Amino acid sequence: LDELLKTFSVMNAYKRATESHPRNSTAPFIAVLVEALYYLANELEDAF
Amino acid sequence: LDELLKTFSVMNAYKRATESHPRNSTAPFIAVLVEALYYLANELEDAF
Amino acid sequence: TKALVNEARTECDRYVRESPRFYDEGTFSIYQFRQTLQQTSQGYDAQA
Amino acid sequence: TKALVNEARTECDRYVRESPRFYDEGTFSIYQFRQTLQQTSQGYDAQA
Amino acid sequence: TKALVNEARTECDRYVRESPRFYDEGTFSIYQFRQTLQQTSQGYDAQAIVEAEPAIKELLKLDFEPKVFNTVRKNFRQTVNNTLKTHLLPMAEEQA
Amino acid sequence: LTLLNQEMQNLGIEFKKYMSAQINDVVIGNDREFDQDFTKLKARMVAR
């Protein structure tokens, strides 16, 4: 967890926002937070 | 547009939030707004 | 037909991004969810 | 193995939902984006 | 069925442990037995203790009522929803 | 023969669509039948 969140970058969550939506090519500023939870949670889940 | 947003319901955007994420089964309260933009935009796009 | 369809879709992709008008303290507050989270929404549902 | 995996995933699904601690005026404000939107982020990018 | 049964049993194993609410001086005192032991319960029986039955019932209600309500109302709903989706979809994808 | 498999491929894609729709209705309570059984479960335990 400490290593995972320490290396967290805005240029990694915003990467996934575009992928999640095949049609739209412009994500809102607020979408950064939402993708952060899933990126920081799904990755943590795989560890267990 | 007037008809589309008039019939907009919280029980229609939250429907899509679960669909967008196959793994997670619990969306944050903030995710309602994000899905509203795409639902209210993609539907509008098809009209043109 | 192809040219207009592409042009129309490109403009339709700009509505998603939130303008400054999208946020307004008086019109709506994002922090009212706390009132629904501060021992108000008991279960992990989206009914309240 | 199957039982523990299912149980572990179920708990991992609860982190995504935002707790009241997730929001804190002093720690971080969601409205600072306006400073990046009020004639600050010129292009439709996510660099600023 | 197996997954839910195991998960349900695991939660059911947490009620047994006593919470701080389980003990309360005013609600019930463990030392009232001395009154039944200080030359009160003559024989090696458990008949005089029946007089204390009304008090213990209230104590158990206080201990369990918050725990049981907490689980069914909040926790149980989440497990069923996630469990069904986490297993059904991968099976459906494999069906394709 | 060059067209038989095209129908088969759509069948797989379409099959997941129906399954995803039915399961989604359960997570939110759209399926009224599931809710009636679920509330019965809660009542029995509290009464028990």
Side-chain angles (χ1 to χ4, degrees):
Chain A
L1 176 144
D2 300 329
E3 181 276 349
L4 181 56
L5 65 81
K6 183 175 64 56
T7 62
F8 176 84
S9 60
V10 176
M11 299 291 86
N12 183 269
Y14 196 85
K15 306 288 171 181
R16 299 157 55 87
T18 295
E19 297 289 4
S20 300
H21 306 153
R23 293 192 62 182
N24 292 266
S25 188
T26 309
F29 274 71
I30 306 304
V32 175
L33 303 178
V34 176
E35 290 292 354
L37 281 303
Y38 296 125
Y39 165 74
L40 184 55
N42 299 21
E43 297 291 355
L44 190 71
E45 170 177 340
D46 299 329
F48 296 160
Chain B
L1 176 144
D2 300 329
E3 181 276 349
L4 181 56
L5 65 81
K6 184 175 63 56
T7 62
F8 176 84
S9 60
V10 176
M11 299 291 86
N12 183 269
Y14 196 85
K15 306 288 171 181
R16 299 157 55 88
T18 295
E19 297 289 4
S20 300
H21 306 153
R23 293 192 62 182
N24 292 266
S25 188
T26 310
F29 274 71
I30 306 304
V32 175
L33 303 178
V34 176
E35 290 292 354
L37 281 303
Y38 296 125
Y39 165 74
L40 184 55
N42 299 21
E43 297 291 355
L44 190 71
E45 170 177 340
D46 299 329
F48 296 160
Chain C
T1 308
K2 296 301 303 185
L4 300 179
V5 167
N6 166 260
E7 194 282 339
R9 179 172 298 97
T10 53
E11 294 185 349
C12 296
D13 193 11
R14 303 179 185 179
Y15 299 99
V16 301
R17 181 176 294 284
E18 63 183 8
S19 62
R21 290 170 287 92
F22 171 73
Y23 170 74
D24 181 7
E25 288 76 350
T27 306
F28 187 95
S29 62
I30 308 304
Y31 306 149
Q32 71 179 27
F33 301 154
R34 294 182 297 176
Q35 310 308 331
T36 71
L37 296 172
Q38 290 299 142
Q39 196 61 222
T40 302
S41 179
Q42 302 299 97
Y44 293 177
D45 57 357
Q47 184 60 35
Chain D
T1 308
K2 295 301 303 185
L4 300 179
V5 167
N6 166 260
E7 194 282 339
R9 178 172 298 97
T10 53
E11 294 185 349
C12 296
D13 193 11
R14 303 179 185 179
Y15 299 99
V16 301
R17 181 176 294 284
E18 63 183 8
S19 62
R21 290 170 287 92
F22 171 73
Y23 170 74
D24 180 7
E25 288 76 350
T27 306
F28 187 95
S29 62
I30 308 304
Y31 306 149
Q32 71 179 27
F33 301 154
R34 294 182 297 176
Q35 311 308 331
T36 71
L37 296 171
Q38 290 299 142
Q39 196 61 223
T40 302
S41 179
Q42 302 299 97
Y44 292 177
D45 57 357
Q47 184 60 35
Chain E
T1 308
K2 295 301 303 185
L4 300 179
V5 167
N6 166 260
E7 194 282 339
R9 179 172 298 97
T10 53
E11 294 185 349
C12 296
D13 193 11
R14 303 179 185 179
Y15 299 99
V16 301
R17 181 176 294 284
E18 63 183 8
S19 62
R21 290 170 287 92
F22 171 73
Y23 170 74
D24 181 7
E25 288 76 350
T27 306
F28 187 95
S29 62
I30 308 304
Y31 306 149
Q32 71 179 27
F33 301 154
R34 294 182 297 176
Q35 311 308 331
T36 71
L37 296 172
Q38 290 299 142
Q39 196 61 222
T40 302
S41 179
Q42 302 299 97
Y44 293 177
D45 57 357
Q47 185 60 35
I49 186 173
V50 179
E51 185 276 348
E53 178 177 351
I56 57 174
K57 294 173 65 177
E58 298 294 350
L59 185 65
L60 299 182
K61 173 265 291 182
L62 180 62
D63 185 11
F64 281 17
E65 186 182 8
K67 293 185 290 181
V68 176
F69 293 176
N70 176 24
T71 298
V72 301
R73 298 173 178 174
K74 293 172 165 290
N75 189 16
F76 187 86
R77 177 61 179 185
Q78 171 52 25
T79 56
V80 177
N81 304 21
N82 176 269
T83 298
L84 293 169
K85 188 190 181 214
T86 49
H87 286 268
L88 199 69
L89 294 178
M91 194 291 302
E93 195 283 336
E94 178 61 14
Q95 193 280 340
Chain F
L1 280 291
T2 312
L3 180 149
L4 181 64
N5 52 7
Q6 286 188 344
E7 191 69 5
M8 299 280 288
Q9 296 181 230
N10 291 26
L11 184 63
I13 301 299
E14 192 279 342
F15 181 87
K16 296 182 294 184
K17 186 62 61 174
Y18 180 78
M19 183 57 59
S20 183
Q22 296 296 134
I23 187 64
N24 177 24
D25 293 1
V26 185
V27 176
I28 302 164
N30 188 268
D31 189 330
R32 190 63 55 185
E33 287 72 1
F34 187 86
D35 298 2
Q36 298 294 351
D37 298 328
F38 184 82
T39 181
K40 181 65 65 56
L41 174 63
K42 289 169 57 175
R44 184 189 300 177
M45 304 303 89
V46 178
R48 177 59 175 178

